[PDB]
Amino acid sequence: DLYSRYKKLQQELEFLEVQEEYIKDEQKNLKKEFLHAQEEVKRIQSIPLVIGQFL
Amino acid sequence: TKQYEKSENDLKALQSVGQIVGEVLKQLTEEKFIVKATNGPRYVVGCRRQLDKSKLKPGTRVALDMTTLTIMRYLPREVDPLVYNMSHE
Structure with a gap:
């Protein structure tokens, strides 16, 4: 079990890697x-661009 | 017969649309020059490749393209009434 899950914990580690x-x-x-x-x-956009009167 | 075709070839030059008159107002960069239409909208366009801005100057009567509105040709001076006030003898 301990070595089992120990060999199960590098799967998602390498997957995240x-x-x-x-x-x-x-x-x-x-x-x-x-x-x-x-x-x-x-x-x-342009080139040519029409300038206008700003308020 | 040949001169009629010459007037036809004359008309082969006329499908090209006439440009829009313009007055160069001032300039900004070599691609941007302050210009206004006779009806009041102000624009900045690029020039053609033959001209130098010494051939333009600010405050100059000019012409622009009909689509790109690019600076192409020009004349410095024009008006209607002047010479037609001269002719009384």
Whole structure:
């Protein structure tokens, strides 16, 4: 039992470890996608842009 | 027969739409120049690639594109009434 559950406690540990490297690479790619989204909002919009009278 | 086709080829240049008159007001950057339509909306557009802003200057009568509204061509001086007040003899 003791050695049994001892061999049962590294399963979720290694599963959380592969989740670490996963979510790291996940938020690494999604970060570059957010940098791409930053290129969108900075490209948005014009050039040419009509200036107007603010109140 | 050939001169008629020349007037046809003349008309082959006329489908291109005429630009909009403009007065360059001032400038901001090389892609942004304060300009206003004769009806009052103010814009900032990019120029064409032949010009230098020494050929424009602020407070200059100019023309803009019909879509991009880009600065393309221009004339410094125009008006209706002037010469037509001259002709009384």
